[PDB]
Symmetry: C3
Subunit: 148 residues, 3 copies
């Protein structure tokens, strides 16, 4: 299979796809919270679910949206960087570690965010996960620059 | 051409690029609504377009931003998943159907959102489009896992 | 290296990775502004940094978030379009120009946004950067369609 175009690719695809699914889980949770708290973003939604007064903001809904937004700010760049990095012939174990640190850091981030864990737990998980991203970004820069 | 690296790739690239253009259309509409409703996000914009009182929120602008955000939550993962999935040798017709259901579902979503269609029309289109994404995500998981 | 799979790829990877790093810079700035202005999005953050009254919005924080969001609306599609476009055998110099115009336009956009430059400076930089994206999108459409 084309999944074996590089030794690091399967690990990357496993971690990335799990993270995409993790984002879908955040979307599902957001919808559930909207229904439970009766806090809808649109009048058409509110009118179907009890009346116009339910078109309103809710702190738990806003928190879910923040977690999802932070995912978009971090996981989407990883999908790009990790894919490219997989083809630069990195040491297989080193590549694994980059992907695993990102996966664990990001899952922990969502748990810390939605679970309202004390500071600086969420911030630490964010920083931890950004480290392999910074590392991959620099490696790609060098490889790209040297092939110009 | 490298567009023929896999039988499903041309269909994927057609649908994905149309969806990117569809997002650009949402951005264009957002700008048009800001100008028509005189609702700008920045004081520098407002001062150029009639005065400081026009740095303000507007429900139609907010709706446009929600549609665009929902696109980012769904179309961006599809760009990743669909690209990878194209290289897993899926049945050409089955792959076509995954891409077409996503394309139709997402175009319908934007129409339902910006057109303020009654509930649950928008929600149904969202769910419909997520189905092929879930399907592709699971298929990638199995392929990645089995190549570890 | 696989970075040489197409003549335009190294230039694309250089520009894209610089833009990802530029987004990370926006994230770093956002955090710094939150701390300086004592404007946190979460009560757990606020309580660690001086008290519950510091869970509040701030116009400079909101501006940073807008810049980051606009980046997600524009740079993420470029990561997709530019990657695909690199493999369509475009003229090397023409491809370079597409990538450079996007890079310069987007860096200028962030400077214009965060620097609060007068209108329509930011809007012009946005439009300039979208031009090569529109161009690449259409080229991909034709290539994909003709391979169906
Ligand atoms: C609310 C936002 C805008 O402001 C702040 C957020 C968090 C923090 N904050 C604190 C603190 O005392 O609150 C400690 C702390 C520690 C790390 C860290 C992470 C990874 C490492 C490794 C070992 C993985 C390199 C080492 C340290 C990151 C952030 C940290 C400070 C300000
Ligand atoms: C506002 C948000 C937070 O809350 C809700 C939103 C929508 C819904 N909602 C309703 C309802 O009665 O309002 C019916 C309904 C039906 C589907 C659906 C979609 C695809 C299928 C196929 C056939 C494609 C599998 C089957 C059913 C999805 C959502 C649906 C309920 C709650
Ligand atoms: C706040 C938002 C919602 O509304 C507006 C924002 C900006 C503008 N605005 C104005 C104006 O007078 O304010 C001039 C202007 C000029 C260009 C442009 C860009 C690139 C080119 C090239 C040469 C690169 C093709 C040519 C012209 C774009 C936008 C422009 C108008 C409305
Ligand atoms: C990938 C999805 C991860 C979901 C993690 C949800 C963690 C929720 O965890 C819950 O958080 C509540 C506050 O929100 C607390 O009151 C509960 O003690 C805690 O169990
Ligand atoms: C935080 C950034 C992590 C550092 O990243 C490191 O940068 C080095 C110098 O560019 C490279 O040689 C290494 O391959 C890379 O892992
Ligand atoms: C890809 C871009 C799709 C744009 C779809 C725009 C649909 C707008 O549709 C309009 O919506 C208005 C309410 O907003 C209604 O008053 C009008 O009856 C309806 O024509
Ligand atoms: C909603 C999820 C759609 C189901 O997706 C299906 O999952 C099966 C089991 O993983 C796979 O064998 C199929 O290829 C896949 O289409
Ligand atoms: C990639 C990151 C780009 C950061 C660009 C930051 C530009 C900040 O620039 C500053 O903006 C202030 C208003 O915000 C002005 O008061 C200052 O005159 C100006 O120096
Ligand atoms: C703004 C859109 C920029 C125009 O883009 C151009 O479109 C032409 C027709 O599709 C193509 O032949 C060119 O390759 C492309 O650069
Ligand atoms: N957009 C982010 C930029 C910086 C960032 O990502 N910070 C991390 C660590 S404090 C975070 O978890 N932010 C919470 C969030 O984005 O809602 C923000 O506003 O905080
Ligand atoms: N971020 C979404 C997560 C769930 C979701 O995507 N729901 C669909 C179906 S109800 C939707 O169209 N949401 C509207 C939106 O995202 O603004 C939300 O807040 O609703
Ligand atoms: N989401 C954008 C859509 C249109 C757009 O991207 N406009 C450009 C040029 S005016 C911009 O810089 N918008 C500022 C922003 O997105 O915050 C908006 O709300 O303005």
């Amino acid at each position: 299979s084309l999944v074996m175009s590089s030794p690091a690719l399967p690990a990357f695809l496993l971690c990335s796809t799990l993270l995409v699914i993790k984002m879908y889980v955040v979307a599902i949770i957001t919808g559930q919270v909207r229904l439970r708290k009766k806090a809808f973003a649109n009048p058409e939604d509110a009118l179907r679910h009890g009346g116009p007064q339910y078109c309103r903001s809710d702190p738990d809904v806003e928190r879910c949206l923040r977690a999802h937004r932070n995912d978009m700010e971090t996981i989407y760049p990883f999908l790009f960087l990790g894919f490219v990095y997989s083809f630069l012939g990195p040491n297989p174990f080193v590549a694994w570690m980059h992907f695993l640190v990102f996966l664990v850091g990001r899952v922990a981030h969502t748990v810390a965010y939605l679970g309202k864990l004390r500071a600086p737990i969420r911030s630490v998980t964010y920083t931890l996960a950004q480290l392999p991203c910074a590392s991959m970004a620099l490696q790609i820069l060098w490889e790209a620059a040297r092939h110009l």
